[PDB]
Protein backbone atom coordinates (compact mmCIF):
# COMPACT_ATOMS: atom_id res chain seq x y z
CA UNK A 1 0.00 0.00 0.00
CA UNK A 2 2.59 2.55 1.11
CA UNK A 3 5.60 0.95 -0.61
CA UNK A 4 3.88 0.91 -4.02
CA UNK A 5 2.98 4.62 -4.03
CA UNK A 6 6.69 5.48 -4.26
CA UNK A 7 7.14 3.38 -7.40
CA UNK A 8 3.85 4.59 -8.91
CA UNK A 9 4.63 8.25 -8.18
CA UNK A 10 8.09 7.52 -9.61
CA UNK A 11 6.33 6.38 -12.79
CA UNK A 12 4.10 9.47 -13.02
CA UNK A 13 7.16 11.63 -12.36
CA UNK A 14 9.04 9.63 -14.99
CA UNK A 15 6.49 10.09 -17.77
CA UNK A 16 6.23 13.70 -16.55
CA UNK A 17 9.99 14.32 -16.89
CA UNK A 18 10.30 12.42 -20.20
CA UNK A 19 8.27 15.01 -22.15
CA UNK A 20 10.65 17.98 -21.79
CA UNK A 21 13.23 16.45 -24.14
CA UNK A 22 10.72 16.61 -27.01
CA UNK A 23 10.63 20.43 -26.79
CA UNK A 24 13.84 21.71 -25.17
CA UNK A 25 15.79 20.33 -28.13
CA UNK A 26 13.84 22.28 -30.76
CA UNK A 27 13.58 25.44 -28.65
CA UNK A 28 17.31 25.95 -29.21
CA UNK A 29 16.73 25.95 -32.98
CA UNK A 30 13.67 28.19 -32.61
CA UNK A 31 15.75 30.69 -30.63
CA UNK A 32 18.52 30.26 -33.21
CA UNK A 33 15.99 31.43 -35.81
CA UNK A 34 15.59 34.79 -34.06
CA UNK A 35 19.36 34.83 -33.52
CA UNK A 36 19.80 34.64 -37.29
CA UNK A 37 17.05 37.25 -37.75
CA UNK A 38 19.15 39.51 -35.53
CA UNK A 39 22.30 38.47 -37.42
CA UNK A 40 20.94 39.54 -40.84
CA UNK A 41 20.90 43.21 -39.77
CA UNK A 42 24.40 43.98 -41.12
CA UNK A 43 23.61 44.72 -44.77
CA UNK A 44 24.78 47.20 -47.38
CA UNK A 45 28.52 46.48 -47.65
CA UNK A 46 30.63 46.89 -50.79
CA UNK A 47 34.18 45.92 -51.76
CA UNK A 48 37.26 47.84 -52.89
CA UNK A 49 40.96 47.63 -53.64
CA UNK A 50 43.87 49.82 -52.52
CA UNK A 51 46.58 50.94 -54.96
CA UNK A 52 48.16 54.19 -53.71
CA UNK A 53 48.19 55.59 -50.16
CA UNK A 54 49.03 59.25 -49.55
CA UNK A 55 47.98 59.86 -45.93
CA UNK A 56 48.41 57.23 -43.22
CA UNK A 57 44.85 57.96 -42.05
CA UNK A 58 43.08 58.42 -45.41
CA UNK A 59 43.89 56.47 -48.57
CA UNK A 60 42.42 55.81 -52.03
CA UNK A 61 40.23 52.80 -52.83
CA UNK A 62 39.38 51.18 -56.17
CA UNK A 63 35.90 49.72 -56.55
CA UNK A 64 35.17 46.70 -58.73
CA UNK A 65 32.54 48.61 -60.73
CA UNK A 66 35.20 50.98 -62.07
CA UNK A 67 34.69 54.34 -60.33
CA UNK A 68 37.24 55.10 -57.63
CA UNK A 69 36.65 56.70 -54.23
CA UNK A 70 38.46 57.67 -51.03
CA UNK A 71 37.62 56.54 -47.49
CA UNK A 72 38.79 57.19 -43.95
CA UNK A 73 39.98 55.15 -40.98
CA UNK A 74 37.66 53.56 -38.43
CA UNK A 75 38.42 53.82 -34.72
CA UNK A 76 38.12 50.04 -34.23
CA UNK A 77 40.59 48.78 -36.84
CA UNK A 78 44.33 49.47 -36.79
CA UNK A 79 47.08 50.17 -39.34
CA UNK A 80 47.97 46.47 -39.68
CA UNK A 81 45.52 45.64 -42.49
CA UNK A 82 45.40 49.30 -43.62
CA UNK A 83 48.59 48.89 -45.68
CA UNK A 84 48.11 48.92 -49.47
CA UNK A 85 47.98 45.78 -51.56
CA UNK A 86 45.21 44.10 -49.52
CA UNK A 87 41.63 43.94 -50.77
CA UNK A 88 39.26 45.52 -48.24
CA UNK A 89 35.52 46.12 -47.84
CA UNK A 90 33.50 49.33 -47.60
CA UNK A 91 30.03 50.44 -46.51
CA UNK A 92 27.35 52.31 -48.43
CA UNK A 93 26.87 54.80 -45.57
CA UNK A 94 29.84 57.09 -44.79
CA UNK A 95 32.14 54.66 -46.70
CA UNK A 96 33.48 53.19 -43.47
CA UNK A 97 35.64 50.05 -43.28
CA UNK A 98 34.30 47.01 -41.41
CA UNK A 99 36.93 44.40 -42.34
CA UNK A 100 39.18 43.29 -45.19
CA UNK A 101 38.74 40.68 -47.92
CA UNK A 102 41.51 38.10 -48.50
CA UNK A 103 42.13 37.36 -52.17
CA UNK A 104 42.03 33.84 -53.61
CA UNK A 105 59.71 16.44 -52.58
CA UNK A 106 59.72 13.49 -54.98
CA UNK A 107 59.26 9.72 -55.02
CA UNK A 108 59.06 7.18 -57.86
CA UNK A 109 57.11 3.94 -57.33
CA UNK A 110 57.37 1.83 -60.49
CA UNK A 111 57.32 -1.93 -60.97
CA UNK A 112 58.85 -3.54 -64.06
CA UNK A 113 56.59 -6.61 -63.81
CA UNK A 114 52.84 -6.10 -63.96
CA UNK A 115 50.87 -2.88 -63.73
CA UNK A 116 48.56 -1.13 -61.27
CA UNK A 117 50.89 1.30 -59.48
CA UNK A 118 48.31 4.03 -60.06
CA UNK A 119 46.13 1.87 -57.82
CA UNK A 120 49.04 1.92 -55.36
CA UNK A 121 48.76 5.71 -55.44
CA UNK A 122 45.05 5.10 -54.79
CA UNK A 123 46.09 2.93 -51.83
CA UNK A 124 48.35 5.58 -50.30
CA UNK A 125 45.86 8.35 -51.10
CA UNK A 126 43.10 6.20 -49.58
CA UNK A 127 45.29 5.59 -46.50
CA UNK A 128 46.48 9.12 -45.69
CA UNK A 129 46.37 11.92 -48.27
CA UNK A 130 44.67 14.94 -46.59
CA UNK A 131 45.61 17.16 -49.58
CA UNK A 132 43.50 17.16 -52.76
CA UNK A 133 45.41 18.40 -55.81
CA UNK A 134 45.37 16.09 -58.85
CA UNK A 135 47.13 16.71 -62.17
CA UNK A 136 46.38 14.44 -65.14
CA UNK A 137 49.05 13.63 -67.73
CA UNK A 138 46.54 14.37 -70.52
CA UNK A 139 46.79 18.16 -70.02
CA UNK A 140 50.17 18.55 -71.77
CA UNK A 141 48.86 17.73 -75.26
CA UNK A 142 50.82 20.72 -76.62
CA UNK A 143 48.93 20.83 -79.92
CA UNK A 144 49.82 24.54 -80.06
CA UNK A 145 53.31 25.97 -80.65
CA UNK A 146 54.39 24.94 -77.15
CA UNK A 147 54.33 27.24 -74.12
CA UNK A 148 53.90 24.88 -71.14
CA UNK A 149 56.56 26.85 -69.21
CA UNK A 150 53.98 29.35 -67.95
CA UNK A 151 51.66 26.39 -67.31
CA UNK A 152 54.28 24.89 -64.98
CA UNK A 153 55.08 28.21 -63.28
CA UNK A 154 51.36 28.95 -62.91
CA UNK A 155 50.56 25.43 -61.68
CA UNK A 156 53.30 25.42 -59.04
CA UNK A 157 52.40 29.05 -58.31
CA UNK A 158 48.91 27.81 -57.44
CA UNK A 159 50.73 25.13 -55.43
CA UNK A 160 52.44 27.91 -53.46
CA UNK A 161 49.20 29.86 -53.01
CA UNK A 162 47.36 26.61 -52.17
CA UNK A 163 48.88 24.77 -49.21
CA UNK A 164 47.19 21.38 -49.94
CA UNK A 165 49.22 19.98 -52.85
CA UNK A 166 49.92 16.25 -53.23
CA UNK A 167 49.98 15.14 -56.87
CA UNK A 168 49.79 11.59 -58.27
CA UNK A 169 51.05 11.45 -61.85
CA UNK A 170 49.91 8.46 -63.89
CA UNK A 171 49.69 7.17 -67.47
CA UNK A 172 53.03 8.78 -68.37
CA UNK A 173 54.09 5.91 -70.67
CA UNK A 174 52.02 7.13 -73.63
CA UNK A 175 53.41 10.69 -73.36
CA UNK A 176 57.01 9.56 -72.84
CA UNK A 177 60.98 13.32 -84.04
CA UNK A 178 60.38 16.09 -81.49
CA UNK A 179 58.42 13.86 -79.10
CA UNK A 180 61.24 14.14 -76.54
CA UNK A 181 61.80 17.89 -76.95
CA UNK A 182 58.60 18.69 -75.04
CA UNK A 183 59.65 16.18 -72.37
CA UNK A 184 62.99 17.98 -71.97
CA UNK A 185 61.13 21.30 -71.92
CA UNK A 186 58.62 20.39 -69.20
CA UNK A 187 61.24 18.43 -67.25
CA UNK A 188 63.82 21.23 -67.39
CA UNK A 189 61.02 23.52 -66.20
CA UNK A 190 60.46 21.05 -63.36
CA UNK A 191 64.13 21.39 -62.39
CA UNK A 192 63.93 25.16 -62.88
CA UNK A 193 61.02 25.21 -60.41
CA UNK A 194 62.21 22.49 -58.02
CA UNK A 195 65.98 23.01 -57.56
CA UNK A 196 65.92 26.75 -56.79
CA UNK A 197 64.19 28.56 -53.93
CA UNK A 198 61.09 26.37 -54.08
CA UNK A 199 58.88 25.26 -51.17
CA UNK A 200 59.90 21.60 -51.29
CA UNK A 201 58.54 20.99 -47.77
CA UNK A 202 54.95 21.60 -48.94
CA UNK A 203 54.80 20.21 -52.50
CA UNK A 204 54.67 16.46 -53.14
CA UNK A 205 54.24 14.35 -56.26
CA UNK A 206 54.14 10.67 -57.23
CA UNK A 207 54.82 9.58 -60.82
CA UNK A 208 53.44 6.29 -62.15
CA UNK A 209 53.90 4.33 -65.38
CA UNK A 210 53.00 0.97 -66.92
CA UNK A 211 56.01 -0.46 -68.81
CA UNK A 212 59.68 -1.02 -67.91
CA UNK A 213 61.00 -0.03 -71.36
CA UNK A 214 59.40 3.45 -71.50
CA UNK A 215 60.72 4.51 -68.06
CA UNK A 216 61.81 7.95 -69.41
CA UNK A 217 65.59 7.75 -68.76
CA UNK A 218 65.40 11.50 -68.23
CA UNK A 219 63.07 10.81 -65.30
CA UNK A 220 65.36 7.94 -64.26
CA UNK A 221 68.07 10.53 -63.60
CA UNK A 222 68.29 11.68 -59.94
CA UNK A 223 66.86 15.03 -58.95
CA UNK A 224 63.30 14.83 -60.29
CA UNK A 225 62.62 11.41 -58.72
CA UNK A 226 65.13 10.72 -55.95
CA UNK A 227 63.21 8.12 -53.93
CA UNK A 228 62.90 5.10 -56.24
CA UNK A 229 61.30 1.87 -55.02
CA UNK A 230 60.78 -1.18 -57.24
CA UNK A 231 57.63 -3.30 -57.18
CA UNK A 232 58.70 -6.92 -57.73
CA UNK A 233 56.97 -8.40 -54.67
CA UNK A 234 53.75 -6.49 -53.89
CA UNK A 235 54.43 -6.33 -50.14
CA UNK A 236 52.84 -9.62 -49.13
CA UNK A 237 53.11 -8.64 -45.45
CA UNK A 238 51.61 -5.21 -46.13
CA UNK A 239 49.06 -6.86 -48.42
CA UNK A 240 48.03 -9.15 -45.56
CA UNK A 241 47.94 -6.13 -43.23
CA UNK A 242 45.69 -4.21 -45.64
CA UNK A 243 43.46 -7.29 -45.84
CA UNK A 244 43.30 -7.61 -42.05
CA UNK A 245 42.61 -3.96 -41.15
CA UNK A 246 40.44 -3.55 -44.27
CA UNK A 247 38.44 -6.78 -43.78
CA UNK A 248 36.64 -5.54 -40.67
CA UNK A 249 33.24 -4.19 -41.76
CA UNK A 250 32.84 -6.81 -44.52
CA UNK A 251 31.19 -9.98 -43.21
CA UNK A 252 32.04 -13.31 -44.85
CA UNK A 253 31.82 -17.04 -44.18
CA UNK A 254 33.16 -18.32 -40.87
CA UNK A 255 35.81 -20.60 -42.37
CA UNK A 256 38.02 -18.09 -44.21
CA UNK A 257 41.74 -18.43 -44.97
CA UNK A 258 43.55 -15.15 -45.56
CA UNK A 259 46.73 -16.77 -46.91
CA UNK A 260 44.86 -18.46 -49.77
CA UNK A 261 43.11 -15.26 -50.86
CA UNK A 262 46.40 -13.36 -50.60
CA UNK A 263 48.33 -15.96 -52.60
CA UNK A 264 45.65 -16.31 -55.29
CA UNK A 265 45.46 -12.50 -55.76
CA UNK A 266 48.97 -11.03 -56.12
CA UNK A 267 50.89 -8.90 -58.59
CA UNK A 268 49.02 -5.58 -58.49
CA UNK A 269 48.41 -4.34 -54.91
CA UNK A 270 46.74 -5.20 -51.63
CA UNK A 271 44.09 -2.52 -52.11
CA UNK A 272 43.19 -4.34 -55.32
CA UNK A 273 42.85 -7.45 -53.16
CA UNK A 274 40.47 -5.32 -51.08
CA UNK A 275 38.63 -4.66 -54.35
CA UNK A 276 38.49 -8.43 -54.91
CA UNK A 277 37.02 -9.07 -51.46
CA UNK A 278 34.56 -6.18 -51.80
CA UNK A 279 33.77 -7.61 -55.23
CA UNK A 280 32.99 -10.93 -53.54
CA UNK A 281 30.74 -8.87 -51.29
CA UNK A 282 29.24 -7.27 -54.40
CA UNK A 283 28.31 -10.80 -55.49
CA UNK A 284 27.21 -11.95 -52.03
CA UNK A 285 24.82 -8.99 -52.01
CA UNK A 286 23.54 -10.24 -55.38
CA UNK A 287 23.05 -13.65 -53.74
CA UNK A 288 21.03 -11.91 -50.96
CA UNK A 289 23.00 -13.66 -48.22
CA UNK A 290 25.53 -12.47 -45.66
CA UNK A 291 27.77 -15.57 -45.67
CA UNK A 292 27.96 -17.94 -48.64
CA UNK A 293 30.09 -20.88 -49.77
CA UNK A 294 33.64 -19.97 -50.80
CA UNK A 295 32.92 -21.30 -54.31
CA UNK A 296 31.53 -17.91 -55.35
CA UNK A 297 34.40 -16.29 -53.45
CA UNK A 298 36.80 -18.33 -55.58
CA UNK A 299 34.80 -17.21 -58.63
CA UNK A 300 35.38 -13.57 -57.68
CA UNK A 301 39.05 -14.22 -56.91
CA UNK A 302 39.79 -16.33 -60.00
CA UNK A 303 37.40 -14.65 -62.44
CA UNK A 304 37.75 -11.08 -61.15
CA UNK A 305 41.46 -11.24 -60.29
CA UNK A 306 42.29 -13.05 -63.54
CA UNK A 307 40.04 -10.57 -65.35
CA UNK A 308 42.23 -7.84 -63.87
CA UNK A 309 45.31 -9.75 -65.04
CA UNK A 310 43.92 -10.13 -68.57
CA UNK A 311 42.33 -6.69 -68.97
CA UNK A 312 45.18 -4.88 -67.16
CA UNK A 313 46.70 -3.50 -70.37
CA UNK B 1 89.70 -24.74 -37.61
CA UNK B 2 89.09 -21.28 -39.09
CA UNK B 3 91.59 -19.02 -40.88
CA UNK B 4 88.95 -16.46 -41.97
CA UNK B 5 91.35 -14.94 -44.53
CA UNK B 6 89.78 -16.59 -47.58
CA UNK B 7 86.37 -15.99 -45.98
CA UNK B 8 86.89 -12.23 -45.78
CA UNK B 9 88.57 -12.22 -49.21
CA UNK B 10 85.63 -13.90 -50.97
CA UNK B 11 83.04 -11.33 -49.91
CA UNK B 12 85.57 -8.50 -49.62
CA UNK B 13 86.57 -9.02 -53.27
CA UNK B 14 83.13 -10.13 -54.57
CA UNK B 15 80.38 -7.60 -53.78
CA UNK B 16 78.62 -6.61 -57.03
CA UNK B 17 80.04 -9.28 -59.35
CA UNK B 18 76.48 -10.46 -60.03
CA UNK B 19 75.26 -6.84 -60.17
CA UNK B 20 77.71 -5.77 -62.90
CA UNK B 21 76.44 -8.11 -65.64
CA UNK B 22 72.74 -7.38 -65.01
CA UNK B 23 72.07 -4.08 -66.80
CA UNK B 24 68.60 -3.84 -65.21
CA UNK B 25 69.19 -2.37 -61.75
CA UNK B 26 66.62 -4.18 -59.60
CA UNK B 27 67.37 -2.05 -56.47
CA UNK B 28 65.78 -4.81 -54.42
CA UNK B 29 66.39 -3.36 -50.92
CA UNK B 30 64.21 -6.19 -49.56
CA UNK B 31 66.56 -9.16 -49.06
CA UNK B 32 69.58 -6.88 -48.62
CA UNK B 33 68.41 -6.00 -45.11
CA UNK B 34 67.98 -9.72 -44.40
CA UNK B 35 71.40 -10.54 -45.88
CA UNK B 36 73.22 -7.81 -43.95
CA UNK B 37 71.16 -8.70 -40.87
CA UNK B 38 72.27 -12.32 -41.26
CA UNK B 39 75.90 -11.21 -41.61
CA UNK B 40 75.72 -9.07 -38.47
CA UNK B 41 73.84 -11.91 -36.76
CA UNK B 42 76.46 -14.57 -37.52
CA UNK B 43 79.24 -12.08 -36.77
CA UNK B 44 77.28 -11.24 -33.62
CA UNK B 45 77.41 -14.90 -32.57
CA UNK B 46 81.12 -14.98 -33.52
CA UNK B 47 82.03 -11.50 -32.20
CA UNK B 48 82.55 -12.13 -28.47
CA UNK B 49 85.68 -14.33 -28.32
CA UNK B 50 86.87 -16.35 -31.32
CA UNK B 51 90.11 -14.81 -32.63
CA UNK B 52 91.60 -11.31 -32.32
CA UNK B 53 93.37 -11.22 -35.70
CA UNK B 54 90.54 -11.27 -38.31
CA UNK B 55 88.13 -9.11 -36.30
CA UNK B 56 90.10 -5.91 -36.93
CA UNK B 57 90.12 -6.56 -40.69
CA UNK B 58 86.43 -7.47 -40.71
CA UNK B 59 85.51 -4.34 -38.74
CA UNK B 60 87.84 -2.08 -40.72
CA UNK B 61 86.23 -3.54 -43.85
CA UNK B 62 82.60 -3.18 -42.77
CA UNK B 63 83.09 0.41 -41.57
CA UNK B 64 84.33 1.19 -45.08
CA UNK B 65 81.29 -0.66 -46.42
CA UNK B 66 79.20 1.81 -44.40
CA UNK B 67 80.61 4.67 -46.48
CA UNK B 68 80.58 2.67 -49.73
CA UNK B 69 76.93 1.70 -49.25
CA UNK B 70 75.18 5.09 -48.88
CA UNK B 71 71.76 3.37 -49.04
CA UNK B 72 70.43 1.56 -45.96
CA UNK B 73 67.91 1.84 -43.13
CA UNK B 74 70.87 3.10 -41.05
CA UNK B 75 70.36 0.49 -38.33
CA UNK B 76 73.08 -2.11 -38.88
CA UNK B 77 75.49 0.61 -40.03
CA UNK B 78 75.09 2.21 -36.61
CA UNK B 79 75.09 -1.22 -34.94
CA UNK B 80 78.59 -2.15 -36.14
CA UNK B 81 80.08 1.26 -35.34
CA UNK B 82 78.56 1.43 -31.86
CA UNK B 83 79.50 -2.17 -31.02
CA UNK B 84 82.98 -1.17 -32.19
CA UNK B 85 82.83 2.11 -30.26
CA UNK B 86 82.02 0.22 -27.05
CA UNK B 87 85.21 -1.79 -27.60
CA UNK B 88 87.12 1.43 -28.27
CA UNK B 89 85.87 2.78 -24.93
CA UNK B 90 87.91 0.29 -22.89
CA UNK B 91 90.54 -0.10 -25.63
CA UNK B 92 92.03 3.29 -24.71
CA UNK B 93 92.05 4.71 -28.26
CA UNK B 94 89.92 7.87 -28.37
CA UNK B 95 91.08 8.85 -31.88
CA UNK B 96 87.98 7.21 -33.39
CA UNK B 97 85.77 9.88 -31.78
CA UNK B 98 85.90 11.95 -34.97
CA UNK B 99 84.92 8.82 -36.91
CA UNK B 100 81.92 7.77 -34.82
CA UNK B 101 80.75 11.35 -34.22
CA UNK B 102 81.41 12.35 -37.84
CA UNK B 103 79.57 9.35 -39.30
CA UNK B 104 76.74 9.64 -36.76
CA UNK B 105 75.42 12.72 -38.57
CA UNK B 106 75.21 10.70 -41.78
CA UNK B 107 73.65 7.79 -39.87
CA UNK B 108 70.95 10.05 -38.38
CA UNK B 109 69.87 12.06 -41.45
CA UNK B 110 67.97 10.67 -44.43
CA UNK B 111 65.50 8.41 -42.61
CA UNK B 112 62.78 8.44 -39.94
CA UNK B 113 64.06 6.92 -36.68
CA UNK B 114 62.15 7.45 -33.43
CA UNK B 115 63.29 4.80 -30.94
CA UNK B 116 66.74 4.08 -32.40
CA UNK B 117 67.61 7.79 -32.54
CA UNK B 118 67.48 8.15 -28.75
CA UNK B 119 69.10 4.78 -28.01
CA UNK B 120 71.93 5.61 -30.44
CA UNK B 121 72.14 9.37 -29.75
CA UNK B 122 73.84 8.87 -26.37
CA UNK B 123 77.13 8.27 -28.20
CA UNK B 124 77.21 12.00 -29.02
CA UNK B 125 77.77 12.80 -25.34
CA UNK B 126 79.31 9.45 -24.36
CA UNK B 127 82.92 10.05 -25.45
CA UNK B 128 82.51 13.82 -25.04
CA UNK B 129 83.80 13.44 -21.48
CA UNK B 130 87.07 12.19 -22.96
CA UNK B 131 87.07 14.67 -25.86
CA UNK B 132 85.90 17.86 -24.09
CA UNK B 133 85.80 19.88 -27.32
CA UNK B 134 83.83 23.11 -26.88
CA UNK B 135 83.06 23.60 -30.58
CA UNK B 136 81.91 19.98 -30.80
CA UNK B 137 79.51 20.58 -27.91
CA UNK B 138 78.33 23.72 -29.72
CA UNK B 139 77.61 21.73 -32.89
CA UNK B 140 76.19 18.45 -31.57
CA UNK B 141 73.21 20.26 -27.97
CA UNK B 142 72.29 22.16 -31.13
CA UNK B 143 72.08 19.05 -33.33
CA UNK B 144 70.50 17.18 -30.40
CA UNK B 145 67.47 19.37 -29.57
CA UNK B 146 66.33 19.94 -33.17
CA UNK B 147 62.72 18.64 -32.88
CA UNK B 148 61.92 16.72 -29.68
CA UNK B 149 60.00 17.69 -26.54
CA UNK B 150 58.05 14.74 -25.10
CA UNK B 151 56.49 12.46 -27.71
CA UNK B 152 57.54 9.64 -30.10
CA UNK B 153 60.34 8.62 -27.69
CA UNK B 154 59.63 6.18 -24.85
CA UNK B 155 62.10 4.33 -22.58
CA UNK B 156 61.44 5.01 -18.68
CA UNK B 157 64.97 6.26 -17.85
CA UNK B 158 64.14 9.33 -19.96
CA UNK B 159 64.66 11.74 -17.06
CA UNK B 160 68.10 10.25 -16.33
CA UNK B 161 69.28 10.94 -19.88
CA UNK B 162 67.64 14.37 -19.62
CA UNK B 163 69.95 15.02 -16.68
CA UNK B 164 72.77 13.54 -18.80
CA UNK B 165 72.10 15.97 -21.69
CA UNK B 166 72.63 19.55 -20.49
CA UNK B 167 74.87 18.84 -17.49
CA UNK B 168 77.84 18.71 -19.87
CA UNK B 169 76.79 22.11 -21.19
CA UNK B 170 76.78 23.13 -17.53
CA UNK B 171 80.37 21.89 -17.42
CA UNK B 172 81.16 23.96 -20.52
CA UNK B 173 78.97 26.94 -19.65
CA UNK B 174 78.77 28.68 -16.29
CA UNK B 175 75.20 29.62 -15.35
CA UNK B 176 72.93 30.00 -18.40
CA UNK B 177 73.11 26.27 -19.20
CA UNK B 178 70.75 25.37 -16.33
CA UNK B 179 68.28 28.23 -16.87
CA UNK B 180 66.45 26.17 -19.51
CA UNK B 181 67.42 22.80 -17.97
CA UNK B 182 66.25 23.10 -14.36
CA UNK B 183 62.93 24.64 -15.49
CA UNK B 184 61.74 21.48 -17.28
CA UNK B 185 62.36 18.97 -14.46
CA UNK B 186 58.98 19.66 -12.81
CA UNK B 187 57.51 16.51 -14.39
CA UNK B 188 60.35 14.34 -13.06
CA UNK B 189 58.85 13.84 -9.54
CA UNK B 190 55.57 12.76 -11.19
CA UNK B 191 57.21 9.90 -13.11
CA UNK B 192 59.20 8.33 -10.27
CA UNK B 193 59.09 8.29 -6.47
CA UNK B 194 59.11 11.71 -4.80
CA UNK B 195 61.32 10.49 -1.94
CA UNK B 196 64.62 11.13 -3.74
CA UNK B 197 63.36 14.27 -5.51
CA UNK B 198 63.91 16.39 -2.38
CA UNK B 199 67.70 16.15 -2.80
CA UNK B 200 67.91 16.86 -6.55
CA UNK B 201 64.64 18.18 -8.01
CA UNK B 202 63.59 20.43 -5.12
CA UNK B 203 67.22 21.55 -4.76
CA UNK B 204 67.72 22.47 -8.44
CA UNK B 205 64.23 24.04 -8.57
CA UNK B 206 65.69 27.27 -7.15
CA UNK B 207 69.06 27.46 -8.95
CA UNK B 208 67.58 28.41 -12.33
CA UNK B 209 65.29 31.04 -10.79
CA UNK B 210 68.13 32.55 -8.73
CA UNK B 211 70.54 32.51 -11.69
CA UNK B 212 67.82 33.75 -14.04
CA UNK B 213 68.44 37.02 -15.92
CA UNK B 214 67.30 40.10 -14.01
CA UNK B 215 65.64 41.78 -17.01
CA UNK B 216 62.41 39.89 -17.72
CA UNK B 217 62.64 36.20 -16.76
CA UNK B 218 62.87 37.03 -13.05
CA UNK B 219 59.46 38.71 -13.13
CA UNK B 220 57.44 35.80 -14.53
CA UNK B 221 59.61 32.75 -13.76
CA UNK B 222 59.07 33.24 -10.02
CA UNK B 223 55.33 32.53 -10.42
CA UNK B 224 55.81 29.04 -11.90
CA UNK B 225 57.21 27.66 -8.63
CA UNK B 226 54.95 29.67 -6.30
CA UNK B 227 51.90 27.80 -5.02
CA UNK B 228 53.47 24.36 -4.65
CA UNK B 229 52.95 22.84 -1.21
CA UNK B 230 56.42 21.24 -1.22
CA UNK B 231 58.07 24.66 -1.63
CA UNK B 232 57.29 25.84 1.91
CA UNK B 233 58.57 22.57 3.40
CA UNK B 234 62.12 23.37 2.25
CA UNK B 235 64.16 25.31 4.85
CA UNK B 236 65.43 27.47 1.95
CA UNK B 237 61.92 28.89 1.48
CA UNK B 238 62.87 31.85 3.68
CA UNK B 239 65.92 32.42 1.46
From Swiss-Prot, chain A:
Keywords for this protein: Acetylation, ATP-binding, Cytoplasm, Nucleotide-binding, Nucleus, Phosphoprotein, Proteasome
UniProt GO cellular component terms: cytosol; cytosolic proteasome complex; extracellular exosome; inclusion body; membrane; nucleoplasm; nucleus; proteasome accessory complex
Cell location: Cytoplasm; Nucleus
Domain of life: Eukaryota
Coiled-coil annotated residue ranges, if any: none
Binding residue positions for ATP: 111-118
Function statement: Component of the 26S proteasome, a multiprotein complex involved in the ATP-dependent degradation of ubiquitinated proteins. This complex plays a key role in the maintenance of protein homeostasis by removing misfolded or damaged proteins, which could impair cellular functions, and by removing proteins whose functions are no longer required. Therefore, the proteasome participates in numerous cellular processes, including cell cycle progression, apoptosis, or DNA damage repair.
Subunit structure: Component of the 19S proteasome regulatory particle complex. The 26S proteasome consists of a 20S core particle (CP) and two 19S regulatory subunits (RP). The regulatory particle is made of a lid composed of 9 subunits, a base containing 6 ATPases including PSMC6 and few additional components. Interacts with PAAF1.
Family recorded in the similarity comment: Belongs to the AAA ATPase family.
PANTHER family: 26S PROTEASOME REGULATORY SUBUNIT (PTHR23073)
Protein name: 26S proteasome regulatory subunit 10B
Organism: Homo sapiens (Human)
Organism phylogeny: Eukaryota, Metazoa, Chordata, Craniata, Vertebrata
Curated annotation (Swiss-Prot), chain B:
GO terms of biological process kind: proteasome-mediated ubiquitin-dependent protein catabolic process
Keywords annotated in UniProt: Acetylation, Intellectual disability, Isopeptide bond, Proteasome, Ubl conjugation
A GO CC term assigned to this protein in UniProt: cytoplasm
Entry annotated with the keyword Acetylation: yes
Cross-link (Glycyl lysine isopeptide (Lys-Gly) (interchain with G-Cter in SUMO2)): 27
Positions carrying N6-acetyllysine: 156
Covalent link (Glycyl lysine isopeptide (Lys-Gly) (interchain with G-Cter in SUMO1)) residue numbers: 27
Subunit relationships: Component of the 19S proteasome regulatory particle complex. The 26S proteasome consists of a 20S core particle (CP) and two 19S regulatory subunits (RP). The regulatory particle is made of a lid composed of 9 subunits including PSMD12, a base containing 6 ATPases and few additional components. Interacts with ERCC6.
Function: Component of the 26S proteasome, a multiprotein complex involved in the ATP-dependent degradation of ubiquitinated proteins. This complex plays a key role in the maintenance of protein homeostasis by removing misfolded or damaged proteins, which could impair cellular functions, and by removing proteins whose functions are no longer required. Therefore, the proteasome participates in numerous cellular processes, including cell cycle progression, apoptosis, or DNA damage repair.
Family: Belongs to the proteasome subunit p55 family.
Disorder association: Stankiewicz-Isidor syndrome: A neurodevelopmental disorder characterized by delayed psychomotor development, intellectual disability, behavioral disorders, mild dysmorphism, ophthalmologic anomalies, feeding difficulties, deafness, and variable congenital malformations of the cardiac and/or urogenital systems.
Protein name: 26S proteasome non-ATPase regulatory subunit 12
Native source organism of the sequence: Homo sapiens (Human)
Covered residues, full protein: 66 to 304 of 456
